[PDB]
From a paper:
The L protein is a multi-domain, multi-functional protein responsible for transcription and replication of the viral genome. The Z protein is a small but multifunctional protein containing fewer than 100 residues. The Z protein mediates multiple functions through interactions with viral and cellular proteins including negative regulation of viral RNA synthesis, orchestration of virus assembly and budding, and countering host immunity.
The final density maps for the monomeric and dimeric L–Z complexes were highly similar to the apo MACV L protein structure, except that additional densities were observed that were designated as Z protein in subsequent model building. The structure of the L protein in the monomeric and dimeric L–Z complexes was also highly similar to those of apo L protein monomer and dimer; superposition of the structures yielded RMSD of 1.2 and 1.3 Å, respectively, suggesting no major conformational changes following binding of Z. Considering the high similarity of the monomeric and dimeric L–Z complexes, only the monomeric complex is discussed below. Previous structural study showed that there was no large conformational rearrangement between apo and vRNA-bound MACV L protein, especially in regions required for Z binding. It implies that the Z protein might interact with L in multiple structural or functional states, such as the monomeric and dimeric L protein in both apo and vRNA-bound states.
Numbering used by the authors: 2 to 175, 180 to 305, 321 to 461, 468 to 513, 520 to 804, 820 to 874, 886 to 922, 950 to 1039, ...
């Protein structure tokens, strides 16, 4: 108490500006007493930051610190039976209110677990307070520190720095486990250095239960089983086995009997059980339509562009919502469109027939704005309807397209042009064909597919790609887009959403459907030869899955001819297998599902089995799944029959077995062409959770809700410990009950004690010892909105608009500024839709209800007849109203559609209004907003409005002043639930909060659990602990490349020796193991670092994995609420209801292993136990295997003296390795001909290319920023694809595919763009710098206009190398811009000015010229701050072809424009300069209007020759030379041969050399490297440094010999 007199005068600089300081300081001065001084003398800061966070927001400070129900009852309000919690600030008027908290942390660690508990605390009030007639916006004040205004941030740290002795002095002078937590609460901005010593500085209190955990856990271990006693028992165990259970048949292997499994396959796949046909097109509904189109159409205009132009004009004017309601905003421009249609009928004699029946309209059909086929006659009604409803209508709505509008409107008269309907009747009854029809829910003639020539076989896939693109841009339709008529097995088609596609110059096709969005529609495909319609089928599928083949006709064609070309030896057999494989590819392309996918992946297991000589005996028992349709059988007869076609011939059909295996394997990986998406989300997450919990509860460890930090009840603990001791039971010599997870703890003692002795290949060495914001809920993961965001941003925008109208008294809402703030902070009509269209349908229907409930939560602010009985109110209205408790989440099958018409159609009173009033002031929306969908055609949303409308919404205190457990929350920064004395089973704070997620792998969904922050904070130390372990280990590869490479090489040279090697995997490696197994492993580890030859301490390691042992895996709500309505887990959760009927949310278990959570800790277990099993085999079977493990895959390479008769050994390995719950998968294969390791199949004499995986990989993962970066992605993946020795021609065909993906997207083209076509060598010698060089200098083919600028490249580069400086400061000649840099260069080289003339009109049009293609700095900075700082493939592409038609291209002038407008700034300059490449290269006079986008190509060509001199070269200057035979498929491994002249280890050599280049660029954020750190400072698209800080990644390339001597050369 030496500062207690100073402590009064210290906060004497706090003037009582309010009541929050006056009474608080007059009670501060009236007693010198240290006993409440840490409480009463410190609560002034508990008043200050409280009031300040209340001083910021709209807040009336209740200094009483009281509850929710009496603050509602201070006015005249009956108390609504609220639960009572504590807020500290209100704003209560109207019929809504504001509860607010404040929480402040410097750590990221429990700053989030406070907000989670806070919003959970006020959102267990949403069940009860919303029913009172009042909503609330529970707002929080997240703070990293103390941001106060009534103090100037200078005395609060004196309050933490001078009181930091006074609690030490008082706790000496005078609470104990509320002493150091006050220390941990009063910390500054900590660099709180947490290592493995993190557990050491807590208390370690216990539970008086963990003794039984150890008593269940550490008994059978001694770590002291002698190495002679291991051999003695293990020899007798082998002698026990070899007479025990090998010969009586409980093994798992056989000799495969290679003939017999062929028959097993024939009975497996060739479904003689099925009712399926032979010709496949009869069976599936889409192949019907394909074979219709390609053999009803292969045997076989200024008004065009005018109609298309004015149609796109209608699309542009439609995206406004400026017709004050959402129904006329289609129909007035429909009137415009049909007026132009009759004006086209009034244009020529043959106008609406000869170029329109062959055009965009067919018989009784009109095409217009969105994609709407409208089928003319209805519009003849509708305008008659609309002029029926408003007789005086086209008087204001026409020149509202001029006034309050851009007024750029190219319409001749069609605005006010109320047409003669009789004139429209003339065209309408002129042409009528059959109306389109759609089908829900025998005969056969399809030319027997292989009875055709090979030429029309691509005409198949062209129609496939044409209908595929139609399915693609089916998505491109707007996602709300509600039509004009609502409302079944066979439906006459009134007006449909309908895409298009060409086929030839006359006949085009369509695609008919009704539902908007992403989900499955019921399609219908009609052709029109010359106007004559034809239905040609009606199928059912889902759009977002056919993103693959959109132009891959040449791509699949290249592989369907390429793979077929592997049979150059059996010509007629090749002539058989060719066409069937192409139809096979078609059928797989026809049917994406999970079943056909998983099957076709599952064929390599059989193929490795027939290739090798031993399988696991249960593989064919699981190599089929049940066909849910008749469609899965179609693929399951052909490749299966193809297996039958060339595995077992009646003669010796194993001749060229290597090509056979390669071929059929690439057939089997041709599975992977199905886009891995698990066709729906809610049937995936339940399937993933059933994959999660079924072996668990079969092993029997399901418990219900823990306390989430620590303590348990007795009974849940009992089944916990029951599973624990049942786990380790599993004796060393029982052969039954072996498929149960666990281990003989005493055989674990053999393994770990022989490990402690240094006779394994690994030991306890342990070099360099390991001892060194928006947050969601947990029950909806796999999605992209939490529930807490969906109240967070709602409350933010609600409180923001709560401010704007009570400054002056506006008292009105803006119906688009209520849609502007949310559209800003999540992702002015054009300013909204400028980035509003950059969303997803999941995001669209979320944003709609966000619009809804923000409009509701602002409609609640100004708030201060059921006798129209149609149906029973107690059976339709109020019964469903109380079953739902919400008018909002009302379903659609409990009612019908017409009751949403008729009871919604109640007559007008003060419940409705007319003259819809798009001003819309607040508080009157109860009659104003309700008529918005009454005057739209829709019925559901107004029904929700009308049912939510009309009130259907119904001294001890001085000692406990020092805050103990009875007084925790009375501060905010008291740091309540930090660890203070950590639990034996928990971290004292959380209990390892996890959730559910899948991964979408090829066959099965690999899982992931949802970590919290502290859970990951503990996960990191354990996984990097094992990382430092496995670095000292010798036979792991989860992160090491080198040992994996040596495993590869010795694997190959074992296979070339003709030696034997296994290949495993592990069925349910994830859900099997438990943390306590790994604790028991860690118990008998010595871990003697060679620093200190001594057993290290593991109590920070052993007691932290106890917390993993008791983890909280949550449940998805989508697996929880799907089980609510009415599959053994679905059976199990319904008997969790007949217990204590809480919903099973929090679930803890024993044996979990999040995959990638404790992964490497299993890897050392999966290393050491593997080497232990490997160790016996040198003494039990006198052979030397070597076993690698990548923590989920394993391999043992067997060395045999002087043939598979030692299967005696082999399943015995299983019989050993099954005992340690590393269960041998039924998918494993062991033999001597084919060995894997992670899809690297190392067969005799060669190596498997595995073509179609990478080929599929390029045709997937087309994600979208820029056609540099997007075409950098497929540039990368083409580097990977040609690493495997595919060809060159496939690569260019992929390049042409992605080129056409650009070209369809409306970017147009550029010689940067996609990479080149026909690239023959460039992959081998060099990165993108040489590829863009070849692409650009193949344009200048005569090699006379660009050899000059490469001469300039030599005259610059040989002066800018060593030996001479010669302006190494070129730093500012370049950075001025594009042209004038090159003008300095070219005169610097030595020539005339005439070259500077003749070159610099070579121009191209850049669209990310000045900035980017904005679809929401030089990118060099981003690559450096990426490397230096350390929604499918279809569904982005639609937001890519939509956010390219927007307002996108920028000038340096502030503002944006369109791509076609830049292409409207064009001319034609036929003299040899524009005419070099059409719409690619320009004259300057061809762009004399807009030449500022006309950047020069030759500047970037010069910079490319310098980058080709940077990253490699001194041959890249030279002339492209002339090449000048072998087997076509004699492919082999070639080497890079790159001559690099830079200096290596660049990672600091460029970052420090950004200062020497441009100062503010790194101020806010060698000999040669800096001159091309300078060739990407000013521009963006060279590709320089990114592939010199990272590496080429392959260096080993294999290619065909016909891609080497056929390739060019560029010698110096």
């Amino acid at each position: 108490d030496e500062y207690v007199q100073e402590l009064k005068g210290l906060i004497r600089k706090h003037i009582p500006d309010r009541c929050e300081f006056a009474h608080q300081k007059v009670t501060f001065l009236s007693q010198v007493h240290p006993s409440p001084l840490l409480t009463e003398g410190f609560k002034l800061l508990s008043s200050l930051v409280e009031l300040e966070s209340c001083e910021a927001h709209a807040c009336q400070a209740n200094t009483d610190q009281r509850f929710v129900d009496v603050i509602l009852s201070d006015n005249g309000i009956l108390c609504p039976t609220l639960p009572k919690v504590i807020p500290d600030g209100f704003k209560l008027t109207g019929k809504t209110l504001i509860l607010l908290e404040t929480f402040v942390r410097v750590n990221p660690d429990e700053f989030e677990k406070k907000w989670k508990a806070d919003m959970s605390k006020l959102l267990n009030l949403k069940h009860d307070l919303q029913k009172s007639g009042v909503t609330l916006v529970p707002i929080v004040d997240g703070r990293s520190n103390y941001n106060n205004r009534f103090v100037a941030d200078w005395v609060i740290e004196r309050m933490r720095w001078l009181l930091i002795e006074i609690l030490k002095a008082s706790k000496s002078m005078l609470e104990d486990q509320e002493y150091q937590r006050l220390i941990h609460s009063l910390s500054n901005v900590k660099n709180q250095s947490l290592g493995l010593e993190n557990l050491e500085h807590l208390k370690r209190n216990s539970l008086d239960y963990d003794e039984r955990l150890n008593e269940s856990l550490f008994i059978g271990l001694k770590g002291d089983i002698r190495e002679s006693t291991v051999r003695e028992e293990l020899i007798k165990l082998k002698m026990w086995f070899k007479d025990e259970v090998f010969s009586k048949g409980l093994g798992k292997f056989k000799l495969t009997d290679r003939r017999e499994l062929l028959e097993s396959l024939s009975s497996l796949g060739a479904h003689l059980d099925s009712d399926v046909s032979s010709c496949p097109f009869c069976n599936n509904k889409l192949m019907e339509i394909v074979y219709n189109v390609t053999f009803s159409s292969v045997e076989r205009t200024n008004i065009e562009k005018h109609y298309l132009s004015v149609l796109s004009l209608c699309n542009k004017i439609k995206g406004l919502k400026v017709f004050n309601t959402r129904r006329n905003t289609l129909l007035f421009l429909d009137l415009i469109m049909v007026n132009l249609m009759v004006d086209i009928s009034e244009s020529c004699q043959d106008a609406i027939e000869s170029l329109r029946k062959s055009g965009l309209i067919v018989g009784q059909m009109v095409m217009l704005v969105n994609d709407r086929v409208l089928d003319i006659l209805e519009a003849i009604k509708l305008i008659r309807k609309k002029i029926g409803t408003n007789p005086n209508w086209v008087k204001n709505c026409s020149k509202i397209l001029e006034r309050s509008h851009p007024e750029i409107w190219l319409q001749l008269n069609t605005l006010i042009r109320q047409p003669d309907f009789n004139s429209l009747i003339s065209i309408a009854q002129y042409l009528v064909s059959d109306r389109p029809i759609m089908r829900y829910s025998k005969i056969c003639r399809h030319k027997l597919f292989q009875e055709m020539s090979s030429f029309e076989q691509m005409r198949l896939f062209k129609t496939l790609s044409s209908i595929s693109l139609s399915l693609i841009n089916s998505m491109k339709t707007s996602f709300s887009s509600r039509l004009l008529v609502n409302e079944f097995g066979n439906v006459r088609l009134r007006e449909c959403y309908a895409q298009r596609f060409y086929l030839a110059e006359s006949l085009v096709g369509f695609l008919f459907y009704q539902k908007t969005g992403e989900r499955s529609r019921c399609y219908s495909v009609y052709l029109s030869d010359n106007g004559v319609m034809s239905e040609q089928g009606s199928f059912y599928c889902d759009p977002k899955r056919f993103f693959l083949p959109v132009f891959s006709d040449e791509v699949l064609a290249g592989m369907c001819e390429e793979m077929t070309s592997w049979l150059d030896f059996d010509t007629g057999l090749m002539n058989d297998t060719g066409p069937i494989l192409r139809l096979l590819v078609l059928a797989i392309l026809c049917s994406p599902s999970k079943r056909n996918q998983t099957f076709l992946q599952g064929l390599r297991y059989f193929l490795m089995a027939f290739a090798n000589q031993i399988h696991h005996i249960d593989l064919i028992s699981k190599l089929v799944v049940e066909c849910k349709s008749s469609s899965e059988v179609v693929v399951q007869r052909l490749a299966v029959g193809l297996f039958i076609r060339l595995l077992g011939g009646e003669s010796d059909a194993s001749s060229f077995f290597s090509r056979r295996f390669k071929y059929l394997l690439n057939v089997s990986y041709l599975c992977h062409l199905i886009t891995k998406e698990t066709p729906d989300r809610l049937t995936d997450q339940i399937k993933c959770f059933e994959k999660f919990i079924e072996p668990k509860v079969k092993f029997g460890c399901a418990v219900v809700n823990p306390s989430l930090n620590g303590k348990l009840t007795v009974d849940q603990e009992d089944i916990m410990i029951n599973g624990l001791k049942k786990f380790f039971s599993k004796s060393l010599r029982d052969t039954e009950d072996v498929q149960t997870p666990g281990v003989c703890k005493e055989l674990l003692n053999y393994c770990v004690s022989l490990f402690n002795r240094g006779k394994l290949k690994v030991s306890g060495e342990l070099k360099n010892n390991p001892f060194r914001v928006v947050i969601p809920k947990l029950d909806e993961l796999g999605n992209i909105l939490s529930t807490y965001d969906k109240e967070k941003l709602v409350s933010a925008c609600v409180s923001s608009m709560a401010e704007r109208f009570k400054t002056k008294g506006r008292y009105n809402l803006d119906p688009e500024s209520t849609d502007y703030l949310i559209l800003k902070n999540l992702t002015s009509q054009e300013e909204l839709s400028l980035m509003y269209e950059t969303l997803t349908e999941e995001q669209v229907e979320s944003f709609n209800e966000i619009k809804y409930d923000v409009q509701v939560a602002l409609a609640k602010m100004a708030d201060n007849s059921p006798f129209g009985v149609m149906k029973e109110i107690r059976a339709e209205v109020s019964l469903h109203e109380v079953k739902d408790f919400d008018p909002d989440v009302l379903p659609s099958d409990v009612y019908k559609e017409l009751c949403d018409a008729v009871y919604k159609s109640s007559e007008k009173c003060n419940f409705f209004l007319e003259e819809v009033l798009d001003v819309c002031p607040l508080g009157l929306l109860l009659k104003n907003l309700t008529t918005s969908s009454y005057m739209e055609e829709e019925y559901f949303m107004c029904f929700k409005y009308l049912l939510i409308q009309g009130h259907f919404d119904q001294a001890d205190k001085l000692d406990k002043s020092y805050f103990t457990n009875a007084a925790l929350r009375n501060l905010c920064f008291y740091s309540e639930d930090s660890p203070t004395e950590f639990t034996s089973i928990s971290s004292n704070s959380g209990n390892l909060k996890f959730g559910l997620s899948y991964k979408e792998q090829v066959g099965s969904n690999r899982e992931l659990y949802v970590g919290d922050l502290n859970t990951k904070l503990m996960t990191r130390l354990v996984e990097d602990f094992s990382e430092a372990v496995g670095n000292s280990m010798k036979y792991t590869c989860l992160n090491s490349e080198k040992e994996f490479e040596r495993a590869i090489c010795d694997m190959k040279m074992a296979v070339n020796n003709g030696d034997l090697s296994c290949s495993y995997d592990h069925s349910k490696w994830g859900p099997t193991m438990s943390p306590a197994l790994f604790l028991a492993l860690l118990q008998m580890l010595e871990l003697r670092t060679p620093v200190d030859r001594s057993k290290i301490d593991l109590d920070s390691v052993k007691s932290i994995l106890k917390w993993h042992l008791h983890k909280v895996v949550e449940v998805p709500i989508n697996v929880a609420e799907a089980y609510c309505i009415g599959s053994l887990s679905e059976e199990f959760f319904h008997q969790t209801m007949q217990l204590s009927g809480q919903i099973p949310s929090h679930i803890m278990s024993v044996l979990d292993m999040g995959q990638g959570i404790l992964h490497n800790t299993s890897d050392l277990y999966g290393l050491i136990t593997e080497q232990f099993l490997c160790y016996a085999l040198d003494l039990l079977y006198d052979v030397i295997p070597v076993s690698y493990t990548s923590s989920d895959d394993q391999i043992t390479l067997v060395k045999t003296p002087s043939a598979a008769e030692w299967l005696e050994m082999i399943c015995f390995h299983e019989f050993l390795s099954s005992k340690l719950n590393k269960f041998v998968s039924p998918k494993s294969v062991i033999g001597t001909f084919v060995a894997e390791f992670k899809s690297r199949f190392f067969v005799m004499g060669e190596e498997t290319p595995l073509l179609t995986k990478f080929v599929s990989a390029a045709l997937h993962n087309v994600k979208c920023k820029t056609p540099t970066q997007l075409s950098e992605t497929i540039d990368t993946i083409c580097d990977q694809c040609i690493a495997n020795g595919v060809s060159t021609k496939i690569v260019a065909r992929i390049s042409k595919r992605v080129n056409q993906l650009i070209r369809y997207s409306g970017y147009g083209d550029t010689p940067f763009g996609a990479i080149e076509d026909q690239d023959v060598k460039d992959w081998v010698d060099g990165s993108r710098g040489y590829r863009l060089q070849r692409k650009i200098e193949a344009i200048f083919y005569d090699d006379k206009e660009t050899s000059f600028i490469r001469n300039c490249a030599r005259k610059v580069f040989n002066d800018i190398k060593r030996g001479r400086i010669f302006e190494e400061n070129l730093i500012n000649l370049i950075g001025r811009g594009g042209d004038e840099a090159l003008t300095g260069f070219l005169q610097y080289a030595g020539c005339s000015e005439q070259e500077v003339n003749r070159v610099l009109n070579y121009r191209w049009v850049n669209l990310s010229s000045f900035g980017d293609l904005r679809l929401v700095v030089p990118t060099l900075i981003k690559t450096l701050q990426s490397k230096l700082s350390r929604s499918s493939v279809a569904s982005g592409f639609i937001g890519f072809c939509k956010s390219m038609g927007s307002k996108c291209v920028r000038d340096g002038k502030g503002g944006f424009l369109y791509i076609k407008e830049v292409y409207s700034g064009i001319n034609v300059c036929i003299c040899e300069i524009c005419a070099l490449k059409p719409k690619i290269i320009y004259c300057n006079d061809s762009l004399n209007k807009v030449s500022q986008f006309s950047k020069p190509i030759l500047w970037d060509y010069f910079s490319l020759v310098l980058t080709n001199a940077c990253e490699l070269g001194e041959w890249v200057f030279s002339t492209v030379k002339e090449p000048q035979l072998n087997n076509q498929n004699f492919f082999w491994a070639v080497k890079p041969k790159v001559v690099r002249q830079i200096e290596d280890q660049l990672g600091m050599n460029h970052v420090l050399q950004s200062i020497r280049r441009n100062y503010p660029v790194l101020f806010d954020e060698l000999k040669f490297l800096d001159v091309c750190i300078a060739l990407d400072m000013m521009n963006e698209n060279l590709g320089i440094i990114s592939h010199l800080l990272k590496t080429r990644d392959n260096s080993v390339y294999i290619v065909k010999q016909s891609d080497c001597a056929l390739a060019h050369i560029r010698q110096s």
